[PDB]
Each structure stands twice: as structure tokens, then as C-alpha cells.
């Protein structure tokens, strides 16, 4: 008797996948990033994501080595699309990142807030009252989460 | 009709808490994403909700560890979902 988000829709909804791998440009232009290494392996995530959400009846929409500029552009498109016949929207972002931000393949910064706020109720009425999911895989700093000992679960 | 807040129905799934690093294995993907998909594939079929799934991800990624830099990873979902989000198969 718990309320549930409807999920029947023919294609369910789009599932973007900004997959950033080659950060060479970012190395060139941004000094504080003279060493960000390329994200070797993303491919496997992208693949897994595609397969998984494809199996869940979502229309995958990959994009590779996008710059901040390009990312915003891509979201703008989906922000303006008409999702009326869609039950859900998903956006996955695989890239480097820092506190609250996502790094563009060119080294530029994109606040995660700027990204998700693109799909509010006003910003995109076609999605109003529909789950808008964002999976962000990136660093949020250079610190290492330390481990603590405990008892088995 | 009726009204709901502008920022309702969102689900943000971060791979790591703020200020920390997340791990990517060149040979098999990121701890987070891989786990996410693994969990998704065996859970959704069973009709499990996304928050449940995300919790399992939290469990799993917690047991993982980068021995070298003696480090770990803590995923952190945040949400304004007003219903259970389930992905039927």
C-alpha cells in the first residue's frame, strides 16, 4: 500500500551517459591538473550501465569525452525535450571531479548542482512528478576515506 | 491536479562522500558503478526499490579497500523521491 513511481512507459525514458576518458586537453589548459590521468576503465562502466539500463527498458544515450561546455549543451537538449510519454529520466556521469564538482574533459569545472538543477519542475515540466535520477562517479576531493574495524554483519 | 515542490522527485547517487576519492580499476570499472549495476541486475527483477538497492551498494563498496594507500570508499545517496522508485523487468 506504499505509493510507487509509475514505470510502464514504452521506452521508460532516456538514460544519458557522459563518459569522460581522455583528459589530455584538461592537462594542457589547466595547470593545477598537470597530471590528471586518463580514466582507463570508464568504458567498462559505460558498457555495464548500457546493458543494465537497456535491460530495464531505458533508451541509452552515450556521449564521450565531453567538455564542460559540451555537457551543459547535452543537458540543455534533454532539459528542453518533451518527456511526456516517459516515466523516468536518468543521467550518469563518469569523469574526474572534486568537492561538489565534476571535471570536464577540458579541465573546466561543473558544479553538480548546476547539472541537476537543470531538471527541476519549472525547468522541465514534462518530467514534473517523475523520478529524475543522477549517478555521479567521480572524486569529490583528494582525501582517502580511512577505515575503522568492527564486527562481522 | 495538485502541487509538489519544484525540487521534488530527485535521486542523486554519489560514488563518494565529499572530500574523498572514488576508485576505478582499469580492468573492471569503478567500485561504485560496477556494484551499482551488479546490484541492479539481481535486485530489480525481484522488485526491489532503488533505495534498497543503493543501500546494498553502500554495504558492498564498504568492504572494498585499496590496500596500497590503505584507503576506502563511502558512497552517499541523497534524495527527494516522494514514492518508492522501482524498475520492473
Amino acid at each position: 500500500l506504499d505509493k510507487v513511481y509509475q514505470m510502464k512507459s514504452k521506452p521508460r525514458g532516456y538514460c544519458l551517459i557522459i563518459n569522460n576518458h581522455n583528459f589530455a586537453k584538461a592537462r594542457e589548459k589547466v595547470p593545477k591538473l598537470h597530471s590528471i590521468r586518463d580514466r582507463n576503465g570508464t568504458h567498462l562502466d559505460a558498457g555495464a550501465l548500457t546493458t543494465t539500463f537497456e535491460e530495464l527498458h531505458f533508451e541509452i544515450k552515450p556521449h564521450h569525452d565531453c567538455t564542460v561546455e559540451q555537457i551543459y549543451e547535452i543537458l540543455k537538449i534533454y532539459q528542453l525535450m518533451d518527456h511526456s510519454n516517459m516515466d523516468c529520466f536518468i543521467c550518469c556521469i563518469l569523469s574526474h571531479g572534486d568537492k561538489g564538482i565534476i571535471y570536464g574533459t577540458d579541465g573546466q569545472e561543473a558544479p553538480i548542482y548546476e547539472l541537476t538543477s537543470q531538471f527541476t519542475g519549472l525547468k522541465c515540466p514534462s518530467l514534473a512528478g517523475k523520478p529524475k535520477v543522477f549517478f555521479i562517479q567521480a572524486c569529490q576531493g583528494d582525501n582517502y576515506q580511512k577505515g575503522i574495524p568492527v564486527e562481522t554483519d | 491536479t495538485r502541487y509538489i515542490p519544484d525540487e521534488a522527485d530527485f535521486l542523486l547517487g554519489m560514488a563518494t562522500v565529499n572530500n574523498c576519492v572514488s576508485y576505478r580499476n582499469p580492468a573492471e570499472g569503478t567500485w561504485y558503478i560496477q556494484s551499482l549495476c551488479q546490484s541492479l541486475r539481481e535486485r530489480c527483477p525481484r522488485g526491489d526499490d532503488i533505495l534498497t538497492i543503493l543501500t546494498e551498494v553502500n554495504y558492498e563498496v564498504s568492504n572494498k579497500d585499496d590496500k596500497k594507500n590503505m584507503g576506502k570508499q563511502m558512497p552517499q545517496p541523497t534524495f527527494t523521491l516522494r514514492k518508492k522508485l522501482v524498475f520492473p523487468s
Binding site: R39, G41 | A15, S22, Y23, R24, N25
Partner: peptide, 4 residues
């Protein structure tokens, strides 16, 4: 084992 690589950081993002």
C-alpha cells in the same frame, strides 16, 4: 586501484 586508481583514483578518480
Amino acid at each position: 586501484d586508481e583514483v578518480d
